[PDB]
Amino acid sequence: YVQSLARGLAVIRCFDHRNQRRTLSDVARATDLTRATARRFLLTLVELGYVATDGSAFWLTPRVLELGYSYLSSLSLPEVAQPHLEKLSHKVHESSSVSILDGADIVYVARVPVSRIMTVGITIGTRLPAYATSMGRVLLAGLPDDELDAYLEKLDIQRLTERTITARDELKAAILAVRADGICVLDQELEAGLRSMAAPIRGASGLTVAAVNISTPAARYSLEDLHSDLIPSLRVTATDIEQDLATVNR
Amino acid sequence: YVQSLARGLAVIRCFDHRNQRRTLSDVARATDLTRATARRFLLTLVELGYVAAFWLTPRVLELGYSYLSSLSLPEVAQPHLEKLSHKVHESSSVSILDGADIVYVARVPVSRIMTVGITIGTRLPAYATSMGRVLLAGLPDDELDAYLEKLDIQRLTERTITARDELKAAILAVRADGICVLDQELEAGLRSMAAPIRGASGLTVAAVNISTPAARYSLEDLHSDLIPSLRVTATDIEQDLATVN
């Protein structure tokens, strides 16, 4: 663990909107350092061209943008989501995906499969009806009310399994429940023996822009086990993806 | 002088759009470090959240953002660019001058099949961009001449101006007109237009622009529809900048 690297970075990070220029003592204070240790880092950064000074105040220069900015700020939603899906899937040993809404269908945009014989994973670019998927109900809960009502007016609900919700009013209710719970569990309404759970991914304004799921055979978990073992991690993954997406698009 | 600081930053610096993933052997080669030294850096960055093969994480954006945020201009401009791009449905930006380059500090992208996208932190030669010519126009004549003395003009497209006196005359006319329209001198099929943003000094300190495919608008349409909006955006940003300083 190279302390000096950590400290030099903390010095760059101590500049912001409220703190545009800082004195040596103020940089020391902001980074939990002393004047003598802070000075060493500040003078190296000045030498490197990352910091400028007039003798009393220090501030950052545009060279700091050379550290990754022009390509990290261009990451797509799937590229932001991928490492987080990989961590989630590796933690719970189940398929995880991200999708977005396209009219009446969800479209898969990122996924991590598991290596099993019987697997429930769908390839990127596949579409599925929004009404019959956990991600779809999450995305639909994110619509403005007039758009949701329009969607539901236009929808031809098909009986896909013996458990598929069949009434427009019961469907609307399941979608509004998702709005209240922050998650959707879909129990074999798409295919018998298959379960999915999904959570919203929001833009920085709180608008739902994508959904993330875990999908699993009904035989691997009771409904109660999903809540104790999988849904907590799914929530954390959704929030991790949100936070990165916000940083990237800032 | 803290050498391990210098090296740790050289490690971050060696990752780019092409080279987003690198093994520990990849990274040591790249920075002329020992495998052993090249290794302790990676792992401090891993503990610190800046690295996760190895790759930069979005937390690396907090370094650049400390700059951007500690400058008044980028966040002051942002809500005006949002309105500008929403009105004209084209990508808009703000940049400042850094030696011979402009550097992008604020943006709003507009996406379609063929997209004009330049990201924050991108650096481009001032002589070949509409914002660079606006920024060079704002230099005192002696600084302009010194800039031109060091400049090696490249042929970026078949249309790029090739002669220094020609370039200097173009810059002086931008100074007179208060805008620059750069028609396909940086990339074939690409047009942009820029207006200056004046600082506390009454001097140009930054520039704002719109860029768009040449095939979307006639030059006439640019002058009639888009450029009047850009000019009011420039002055809205100058006014907001004055309140904050």
Side-chain angles (χ1 to χ4, degrees), chain A residues 1-17 19-158 160-161 163-250, chain B residues 1-16 19-21 28 30 36 38 41 44-46 48-245:
Chain A
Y1 182 91
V2 185
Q3 186 170 72
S4 282
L5 181 52
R7 293 178 172 184
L9 295 170
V11 168
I12 291 172
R13 296 272 311 255
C14 87
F15 307 89
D16 54 27
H17 170 80
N19 298 268
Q20 310 191 329
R21 296 196 163 194
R22 291 189 185 262
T23 54
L24 183 55
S25 295
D26 193 52
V27 165
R29 196 197 191 176
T31 55
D32 287 332
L33 293 182
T34 58
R35 297 177 41 90
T37 53
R39 178 184 299 108
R40 286 192 71 245
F41 301 105
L42 283 166
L43 294 179
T44 301
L45 296 166
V46 169
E47 197 146 7
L48 292 174
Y50 288 109
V51 166
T53 187
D54 65 10
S56 52
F58 301 84
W59 57 92
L60 299 171
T61 74
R63 185 176 306 243
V64 190
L65 296 175
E66 310 205 31
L67 304 160
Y69 211 92
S70 63
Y71 86 83
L72 292 175
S73 65
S74 74
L75 298 176
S76 61
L77 160 84
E79 293 168 327
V80 166
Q82 202 63 37
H84 297 293
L85 296 186
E86 291 288 341
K87 299 174 208 112
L88 178 55
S89 278
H90 178 69
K91 184 192 194 189
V92 307
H93 304 297
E94 300 301 338
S95 156
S96 62
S97 305
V98 164
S99 61
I100 62 169
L101 192 66
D102 190 357
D105 292 316
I106 64 175
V107 186
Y108 279 69
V109 293
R111 68 138 182 177
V112 169
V114 290
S115 305
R116 284 205 297 269
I117 293 164
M118 185 179 77
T119 62
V120 290
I122 278 151
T123 64
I124 291 163
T126 305
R127 307 190 175 242
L128 290 179
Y131 81 91
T133 59
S134 66
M135 287 190 296
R137 295 187 184 172
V138 167
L139 289 159
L140 297 173
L143 290 177
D145 287 327
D146 50 3
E147 299 186 4
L148 177 59
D149 279 324
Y151 164 83
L152 286 171
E153 208 167 343
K154 173 141 93 195
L155 183 57
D156 182 9
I157 296 163
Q158 317 205 294
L160 306 174
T161 73
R163 305 162 74 100
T164 309
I165 281 178
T166 217
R168 290 182 166 109
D169 57 285
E170 192 190 350
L171 174 55
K172 194 186 197 316
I175 289 154
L176 307 180
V178 175
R179 209 175 260 187
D181 303 352
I183 59 151
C184 174
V185 181
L186 202 135
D187 183 14
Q188 325 182 52
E189 294 189 46
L190 183 56
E191 194 163 278
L194 170 68
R195 284 184 187 144
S196 294
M197 61 237 63
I201 290 161
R202 304 180 150 107
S205 66
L207 281 215
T208 301
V209 298
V212 51
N213 91 354
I214 294 164
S215 194
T216 196
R220 301 185 70 68
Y221 306 90
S222 67
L223 288 175
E224 160 204 319
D225 305 335
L226 305 176
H227 293 274
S228 42
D229 300 337
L230 303 182
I231 289 166
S233 296
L234 175 64
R235 279 183 195 273
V236 175
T237 295
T239 71
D240 294 345
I241 292 174
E242 282 183 346
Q243 289 190 1
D244 273 356
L245 199 60
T247 304
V248 165
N249 296 111
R250 192 157 52 167
Chain B
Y1 181 92
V2 182
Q3 181 189 115
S4 54
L5 180 53
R7 302 180 155 194
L9 289 160
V11 178
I12 296 168
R13 276 289 286 253
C14 82
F15 292 83
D16 58 48
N19 295 298
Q20 309 194 18
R21 266 141 154 281
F41 295 132
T44 294
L45 300 163
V46 177
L48 293 172
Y50 296 111
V51 167
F54 292 95
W55 61 93
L56 303 196
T57 75
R59 176 182 311 229
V60 169
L61 295 167
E62 308 291 6
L63 294 166
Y65 198 68
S66 297
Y67 172 67
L68 294 173
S69 65
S70 74
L71 222 55
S72 321
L73 175 70
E75 292 181 319
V76 159
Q78 197 65 43
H80 296 288
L81 297 188
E82 296 283 348
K83 280 166 158 185
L84 181 52
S85 282
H86 181 74
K87 173 176 187 192
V88 306
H89 303 296
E90 300 302 335
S91 305
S92 64
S93 293
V94 165
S95 65
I96 61 178
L97 195 58
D98 188 40
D101 304 317
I102 69 179
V103 47
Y104 279 64
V105 298
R107 115 209 261 232
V108 170
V110 168
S111 202
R112 37 174 91 89
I113 295 150
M114 195 167 60
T115 299
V116 186
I118 295 171
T119 44
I120 292 167
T122 300
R123 300 170 66 81
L124 294 168
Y127 75 89
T129 53
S130 57
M131 289 193 290
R133 294 186 183 173
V134 164
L135 286 163
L136 295 167
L139 291 182
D141 285 352
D142 59 329
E143 285 177 31
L144 180 56
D145 290 333
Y147 166 83
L148 294 170
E149 187 62 39
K150 292 167 294 177
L151 176 62
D152 201 301
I153 296 169
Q154 298 168 42
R155 196 203 209 255
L156 303 175
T157 82
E158 77 194 347
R159 290 183 191 250
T160 316
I161 278 177
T162 48
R164 283 178 222 188
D165 51 10
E166 202 196 345
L167 181 65
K168 181 180 182 175
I171 288 163
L172 256 42
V174 170
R175 185 188 284 176
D177 309 337
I179 57 148
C180 173
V181 181
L182 196 95
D183 181 20
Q184 301 178 93
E185 294 191 47
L186 182 64
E187 280 185 12
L190 173 69
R191 282 181 180 155
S192 68
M193 57 228 74
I197 293 161
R198 289 170 296 151
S201 37
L203 260 38
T204 294
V205 297
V208 49
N209 100 340
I210 298 158
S211 294
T212 190
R216 278 190 65 85
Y217 298 94
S218 60
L219 283 184
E220 175 197 8
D221 294 332
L222 302 183
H223 288 289
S224 289
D225 304 344
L226 270 58
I227 293 165
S229 290
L230 172 69
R231 289 179 178 273
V232 309
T233 302
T235 58
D236 286 353
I237 288 167
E238 292 179 346
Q239 292 177 12
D240 272 5
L241 208 53
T243 80
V244 304
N245 289 319

